[PDB]
Enzyme design. Structure first.
Site, mmCIF file in Angstrom:
data_model
loop_
_atom_site.group_PDB
_atom_site.id
_atom_site.type_symbol
_atom_site.label_atom_id
_atom_site.label_comp_id
_atom_site.label_asym_id
_atom_site.label_seq_id
_atom_site.Cartn_x
_atom_site.Cartn_y
_atom_site.Cartn_z
ATOM 1 N N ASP A 11 8.146 18.490 8.125
ATOM 2 C CA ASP A 11 7.849 17.696 6.941
ATOM 3 C C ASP A 11 6.349 17.524 6.740
ATOM 4 O O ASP A 11 5.879 16.479 6.271
ATOM 5 C CB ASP A 11 8.543 16.330 7.042
ATOM 6 C CG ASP A 11 8.774 15.675 5.687
ATOM 7 O OD1 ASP A 11 8.324 16.211 4.636
ATOM 8 O OD2 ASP A 11 9.403 14.600 5.575
ATOM 9 N N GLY B 217 11.870 2.432 2.881
ATOM 10 C CA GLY B 217 11.415 1.135 2.381
ATOM 11 C C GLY B 217 9.977 1.179 1.912
ATOM 12 O O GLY B 217 9.605 2.066 1.148
ATOM 13 N N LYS C 148 5.913 -0.750 8.554
ATOM 14 C CA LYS C 148 6.887 0.035 7.814
ATOM 15 C C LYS C 148 8.218 -0.699 7.713
ATOM 16 O O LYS C 148 8.960 -0.806 8.700
ATOM 17 C CB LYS C 148 7.082 1.400 8.471
ATOM 18 C CG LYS C 148 7.711 2.436 7.556
ATOM 19 C CD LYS C 148 7.953 3.711 8.318
ATOM 20 C CE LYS C 148 8.343 4.837 7.394
ATOM 21 N NZ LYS C 148 8.859 5.981 8.201
ATOM 22 N N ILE D 33 0.804 -1.229 0.000
ATOM 23 C CA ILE D 33 0.000 0.000 0.000
ATOM 24 C C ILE D 33 0.839 1.282 0.000
ATOM 25 O O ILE D 33 0.386 2.328 0.464
ATOM 26 C CB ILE D 33 -1.049 0.012 1.155
ATOM 27 C CG1 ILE D 33 -0.383 -0.103 2.530
ATOM 28 C CG2 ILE D 33 -2.140 -1.065 0.925
ATOM 29 C CD1 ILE D 33 -1.170 0.570 3.648
HETATM 30 C C1 LIG Z 1 1.955 6.180 0.577
HETATM 31 C C2 LIG Z 1 1.710 5.670 1.995
HETATM 32 C C3 LIG Z 1 2.662 4.525 2.322
HETATM 33 C C4 LIG Z 1 1.858 6.790 3.022
HETATM 34 C C5 LIG Z 1 0.762 7.859 2.962
HETATM 35 O O1 LIG Z 1 1.359 9.133 2.691
HETATM 36 N N1 LIG Z 1 1.998 6.222 4.359
HETATM 37 C C6 LIG Z 1 1.014 5.821 5.210
HETATM 38 N N2 LIG Z 1 -0.313 5.796 4.866
HETATM 39 C C7 LIG Z 1 -1.275 5.378 5.739
HETATM 40 N N3 LIG Z 1 -2.603 5.361 5.447
HETATM 41 C C8 LIG Z 1 -3.209 5.101 4.269
HETATM 42 C C9 LIG Z 1 -4.068 3.999 4.192
HETATM 43 C C10 LIG Z 1 -4.750 3.698 3.012
HETATM 44 N N4 LIG Z 1 -5.564 2.620 2.956
HETATM 45 C C11 LIG Z 1 -4.586 4.513 1.895
HETATM 46 C C12 LIG Z 1 -3.740 5.622 1.971
HETATM 47 CL CL1 LIG Z 1 -3.566 6.484 0.754
HETATM 48 C C13 LIG Z 1 -3.055 5.929 3.155
HETATM 49 C C14 LIG Z 1 -0.828 4.962 7.103
HETATM 50 N N5 LIG Z 1 -1.429 4.509 8.219
HETATM 51 C C15 LIG Z 1 -0.468 4.286 9.151
HETATM 52 N N6 LIG Z 1 0.758 4.577 8.677
HETATM 53 C C16 LIG Z 1 2.023 4.439 9.472
HETATM 54 C C17 LIG Z 1 3.278 4.836 8.688
HETATM 55 C C18 LIG Z 1 1.928 5.403 10.652
HETATM 56 C C19 LIG Z 1 0.609 5.007 7.410
HETATM 57 N N7 LIG Z 1 1.448 5.435 6.438
#
Ligand SMILES: CC(C)[C@@H](CO)Nc1nc(Nc2cc(N)cc(Cl)c2)c2ncn(C(C)C)c2n1
Lengths: 280, 244
Positions: A131, A12, A30, A10
């Protein structure tokens, strides 16, 4: 092979997975690359982990939560997994998917309220999240805001050195573009730009380069006098931010103030008459 | 190259001081320094911290790397065991972690090694420290209090550069001495500041006039402030490269 958790991705790299410890919940994994024979654990990760660990007894609603760190190691390298709470959506994808006239303005108020509080928390513990961008702002299904990705954050102290590189150019403050000292105000600049990107569902200052960047800013904010300059290069903000109510414009400019010493702070922004009409 | 300037949000807000005192109440109550240890003693500590100090001073690291690297060391040595023949490796990897967190240009492995084991051995020691503390590496440092205290004692901003400069040097050297480890960061800091204000008063009120106040700001008794002033001052005297 996935240990204690059930993991093609969805984002490193970040993955959505469940826990076999709990009743079959949901966590965000992560995975972090740590190149063999270098400097040891990545700078970026230690900083991120340390902030979130340091403040986790404050159980603050508007910061993301960290659960564990993997560390797993002959032939293999280090394998760094970090389990976080899962949040269903970031701000970017949210803004993209929200059905027509865009996001209801009540959502714009409360989400911005929640963001400013996340920030007010951080700065009062001397942490600057350097950031902020919509990809780093997560939203729960109860419309709830969660600041994420702390790998550039640090405890600020008087007279400490700084890299001249922080925030994506699209959200970078003038302080940083002009290569000067920067501090907390750097977060409110992002806030200013996220607040706009919310109403108009498109970024406000988008450029190819730093000089270009700086130009598109002075395009709107104007070129302010020498007093507020620490002989190169207004059109009222409403031109690029239609659908904004009068009281939101005052906040918006207040955060998008050129001189860093004169910018609005998270604390007193939270008490700007714009949020007055909230629900509580 | 760029250095952090005065930021009213982070330095003048009354509640930043409040939170520092609060987060201070998090780290462990040290009754007896290094008590869990079978081999290495407190005398060993003083030599190793003298070296760790030299290293930060010589490579010109931000004033807050050393305090933190001391904190990491003690915390770490409440959990795993140290041997005299490996103490240096431990202290080396604390400065590594510390510099990586509180400074812009970290210390490199290829620099602590050559100047002290192979690199994998340093890296494994960084990996063993981190996972023992469960990656909870940050902490309130004596040194984080300096400016909030200055602002609260209503000292005019104009003096913060010089005062900061002298008092952090003073605090960083005192922290070498065993009896300083047990004091609360805010007290260590208070003391560092009083010492400084005394030797080279310099267009500034006499130490006396700040005791009563620090007592109220920090919420300790006037006596326990006066004693910590004298303790820091003495600890600072005790510094000696001859001992390595
Ligand atoms: C591209 C993606 C990997 C990024 C969002 O900027 N990271 C992300 N995105 C999340 N949420 C998310 C879930 C779905 N289903 C779709 C999108 Cl676009 C973001 C998250 N929920 C928890 N974490 C951790 C790192 C604290 C999350 N990290």
């Amino acid at each position: 092979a996935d240990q204690q958790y059930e993991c093609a991705e969805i984002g490193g790299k970040v993955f959505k997975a469940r826990d076999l410890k709990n009743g079959g919940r949901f966590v965000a994994l992560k995975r972090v690359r740590v190149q063999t024979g270098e400097e040891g654990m990545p700078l970026s990760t230690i900083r991120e982990v340390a902030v979130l660990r340091h403040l986790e007894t404050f159980e603050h609603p508007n910061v993301v939560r960290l659960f564990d760190v993997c560390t797993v190691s002959t032939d293999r390298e280090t394998k760094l997994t970090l389990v976080f709470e899962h949040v269903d959506q970031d701000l970017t994808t949210y803004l993209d998917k929200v059905p027509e006239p865009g996001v209801p303005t009540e959502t714009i108020k409360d989400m911005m309220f929640q963001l400013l509080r996340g920030l007010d928390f951080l700065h009062s513990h001397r942490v600057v999240h350097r950031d902020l961008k919509p990809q780093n702002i997560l939203v729960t299904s109860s419309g709830q805001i969660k600041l994420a990705d702390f790998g550039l954050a640090r405890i600020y102290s008087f007279q400490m050195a700084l890299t001249s590189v922080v925030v994506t150019l699209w959200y970078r403050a003038p302080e940083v573009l002009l290569q000067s000292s920067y501090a907390t105000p750097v977060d409110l600049w992002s806030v200013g730009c996220i607040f706009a990107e919310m109403f108009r569902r498109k970024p406000l200052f988008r450029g190819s380069s730093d000089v270009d960047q700086l130009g598109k800013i002075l395009d709107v904010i104007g070129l302010p006098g020498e007093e507020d300059w620490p002989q190169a290069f207004a059109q009222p903000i409403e031109k690029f931010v239609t659908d904004i109510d009068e009281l939101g414009k005052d906040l918006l400019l207040k955060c998008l103030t050129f001189n860093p010493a004169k910018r609005i702070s998270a604390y007193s922004a939270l008490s700007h008459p714009y949020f007055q009409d909230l629900e509580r | 190259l760029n250095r952090a300037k005065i930021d009213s949000t982070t330095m003048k807000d009354p509640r930043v001081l409040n939170n520092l005192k609060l987060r201070e109440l998090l780290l462990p109550k040290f009754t007896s320094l290094w008590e869990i240890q079978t081999e290495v003693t407190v005398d060993n500590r003083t030599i190793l911290l003298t070296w760790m100090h030299l290293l930060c001073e010589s490579f010109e690291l931000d004033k807050s790397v050393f305090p933190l690297s001391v904190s990491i060391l003690d915390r770490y040595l409440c959990k795993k065991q140290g041997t005299k023949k490996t103490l240096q490796k431990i202290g080396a990897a604390c400065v590594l972690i510390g510099s990586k967190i509180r400074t812009v240009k970290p210390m490199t492995v290829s620099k602590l090694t050559y100047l002290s084991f192979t690199n994998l051995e340093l890296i494994n020691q960084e990996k063993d420290i981190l996972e023992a503390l469960k990656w909870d590496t940050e902490a309130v440092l004596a040194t984080d209090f300096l400016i909030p205290l200055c602002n609260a004692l209503k000292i005019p901003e104009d003096l913060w550069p010089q005062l900061y400069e002298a008092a952090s040097t003073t605090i960083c050297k005192a922290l070498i001495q065993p009896n300083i480890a047990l004091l609360s960061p805010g007290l260590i800091c208070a003391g560092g500041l009083l010492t400084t204000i005394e030797t080279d008063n310099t267009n500034c009120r006499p130490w006396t006039c700040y005791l009563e106040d620090l007592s109220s700001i920090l919420n300790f008794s006037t006596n326990t402030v006066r004693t910590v002033k004298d303790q820091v001052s003495e600890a600072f005297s005790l510094y000696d490269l001859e001992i390595l």
